[PDB]
Amino acid sequence: GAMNSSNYAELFNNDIKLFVDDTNVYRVTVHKTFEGNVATKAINGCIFTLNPKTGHLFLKIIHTSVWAGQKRLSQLAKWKTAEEVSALVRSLPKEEQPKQIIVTRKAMLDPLEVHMLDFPNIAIRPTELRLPFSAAMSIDKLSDVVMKATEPQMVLFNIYDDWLDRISSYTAFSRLTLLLRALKTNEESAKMILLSDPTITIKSYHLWPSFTDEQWITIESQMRDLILTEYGRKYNV
Amino acid sequence: MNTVPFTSAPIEVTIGIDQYSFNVKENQPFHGIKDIPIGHVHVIHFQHADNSSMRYGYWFDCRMGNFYIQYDPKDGLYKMMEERDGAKFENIVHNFKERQMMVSYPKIDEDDTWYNLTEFVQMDKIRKIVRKDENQFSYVDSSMTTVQENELSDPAHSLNYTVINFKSREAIRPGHEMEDFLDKSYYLNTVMLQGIFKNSSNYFGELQFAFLNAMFFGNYGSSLQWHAMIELICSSATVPKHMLDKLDEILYYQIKTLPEQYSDILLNERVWNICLYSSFQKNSLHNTEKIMENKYPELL
Ligand SMILES: CC[C@H](N)c1ccccc1O
Secondary structure, X not given: OOEOHHHHHHHHOOOOEEEEEOOOOOEEEEEEOOOOOEEEEEEOEEEXXXXXXXXXXXXXXXXXXXXXXXXXXXXXXXXXXXXXXXXXXXXXXXXXXXXXXXXXXXXXHHHHHHHOXXXXXXXXXXXXXXXXXXXXXXXXHHHHHHHHOOOOEEEEEEOOOOHHHOOOHHHHHHHHHHHHHHHHHOHHHHHHHHHOOOOOOEOOOOOOEOOOHHHHHHXXXXXXXXXXXXXXXXXXX | OEXXXXXXOOOOEEEEEOOEEEEEOOOXXXXXXXXEOXXXXXXXXXXXXXXXXXXEEEEEOHHHOEEEEEEEOOOOEEEEEEEOOHHHHHHHHHHHHHOOOOEEOOOOOOOXXXXXXXXXXXXHHHHHHOOOOOOOOEXXXXXXXXXXXXXXXXXXXXXXXXXXXXXXXXXXXOOOHHHHXXXXXXXXXXXXXXXXXXXXXXXHHHHHHHHHHHHHHOOHHHHHHHHHHHHHHHOOOOOOHHHHHHHHHHHHHHHHHOXXXXXXXXXXXXXXXXXXXXXXXXXXXXXXXXXXXXXXXOOO
């Protein structure tokens, strides 16, 4: 059934599972036309398919050419997501295929279910969790590879860098969702927090800076403060 | 005008014959139903006064044999049987008629209701949904489950309706996932109509039979089937024009006949609102939409 706060440790057991977030698949700028009407212009997007245990990220870049002459794009984008996730599963060796796929938005259930009919033993699940994966395009290296793409492309990352050498998957996921929640709530402030100290750099092969254990605690606290500050502004509390 | 005689009525029971019904008291001199119109299937059905759990009944066609009812005190039900001795049967009936111990099928001449509910229903197709080949008539009751319900447990007692499942490989061509899911025309026209049913008359016959079993026995799996067959048509963008017109007529008489006090359980809000207001065919069911709106505006 649905994934929620009650069954949260299930994300870090040894049953292979993937989250799929489709927020950033169909991305548009809305603008005015010469005649004063409103039009959209698509930009490249991405499917965010993540193993929460291992950090492996399958970033399928969705090039604007896929929408060319297509109607009802927001609907089509769900089916394209489901087509590409099914293609990813088919491309993996059997022992790497997920036993569950958790969609972050319930509207992905039927499209993914229909595309996965050849995989009856892969459970497609919704979740009650509010996850911040829409903020993936606030990670500079992910945004850069999506925007620069000139054709459809799959790019592989470990979204946890090397954190699992020192911390558990549960703690790594909690750090990731805290970072992304901060970037979602106030991107400018979050990025300032992450890059304020020039002496801490991002490895060429990483996404996030190379913080020591003690520096991560400071960073995490600064991210929590940001989220609370923003909350007291939203609601005046 | 054929007759179904009754050996007796030893237990108090409400007896239905098609859309009509009669209350019979314990040991009352009821000996059957005469003047049954030839040309249609019919259903005789029973709800016992002392125990309203389990409505049951028998689908039959008097052109196929001479049938009668007899109470079985061991299994506790009125059973249909076939009499193979024609002279014996004519004799029994003629005597009961002469003593006026039979009720008359109370059909108004102006009234096409039963024809309209059974236009495409054929006894030979019933016997394939309800498999008991040693009889020419078919038993159905409130509790019988369908093959589809079973898959999700006694197969000899099942309703073998055609399985419809919108999220199945049968319904979805590889490579046309989105197309086939949002527009069910290939599943309706190629898989179901051309492949399984062979023609629209057989499809409508099963749809009509499912509805009647839902209405007369409260058979929940039949209601599921009726709604699925409606939804498959309404969710197809490409439907022969003759089928849409006929469907509108079929559903109109079904909604007209449904007891008003049963709409809650036998009508599925999602299917009807989708079919009349959202689906491709939202505009092709004018008579059905008019009677639904005037009779059941709550559901909508
Ligand atoms: C299921 C048996 C039960 N005593 C029953 C319920 C109603 C009518 C007949 C009948 O035999």
